[PDB]
Amino acid sequence: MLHTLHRSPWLTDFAALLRLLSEGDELLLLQDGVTAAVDGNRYLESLRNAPIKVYALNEDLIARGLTGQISNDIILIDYTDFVRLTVKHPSQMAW
């Protein structure tokens, strides 16, 4: 299941989101969601301790001037990768 977060983690029911993550799932941060990928932010640890791989849409990091402050644990992708990610997963849970 591909999980998508387009809102700021600070304005998201983050606990509810974590409870839906299962091993093998993947989380893509896009739009305002990419702020959760900033090195040192308070939501980063919970994501790292989650049994999944976390991605961040590069276009949105560029839009927000955050390209040089992303955690090494987060994978940078573009729209084409985003597409392939949706092809890879049969389902998508959008937050």
């Binding site: 029911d13 409870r19 839906l20 049969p90 389902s91 849970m93 959008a94």
Partner: protein, 119 residues
């Protein structure tokens, strides 16, 4: 064949998501029996009885949840963890016959669906 899951995650009235989600749910039920409904996060508030939204000039669409029982939409679940965070009695007589599931179980059940539409 695709199985469709509808997930209510927002509180009622503040936003029209619940109303429009229920509308989408019912239209879909007419084309397939392979669908389920999940109430998670704030969406658990959709289930409370005695709601009277006309007080805030909002449509009383909660009554429409009765059609789930009427037209055999039986795969209904509610997040037990969410109800606890919100201080809601797990024994509350919800307007939908949703059986509570713990985090792990709800998660596994949702993973059985091909499409997830969140409201």
């Amino acid at each position: 064949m695709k199985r469709i899951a509808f997930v209510f995650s927002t509180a009622p009235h503040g936003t029209a998501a619940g109303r429009e989600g229920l509308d989408a749910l019912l239209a879909t039920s007419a084309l397939t029996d392979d669908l389920a409904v999940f109430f998670i996060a704030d969406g658990v508030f959709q289930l409370l009885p005695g709601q009277k939204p006309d007080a805030v000039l909002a449509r009383d669409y909660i009554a429409t949840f009765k059609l789930l029982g009427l037209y055999d939409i039986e795969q209904c679940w509610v997040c037990a963890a969410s109800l606890r965070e919100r201080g809601l009695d797990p024994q509350t007589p919800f307007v939908v016959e949703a059986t509570p599931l713990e985090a792990d179980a709800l998660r596994r059940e949702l993973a059985n669906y091909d499409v997830i539409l969140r409201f």
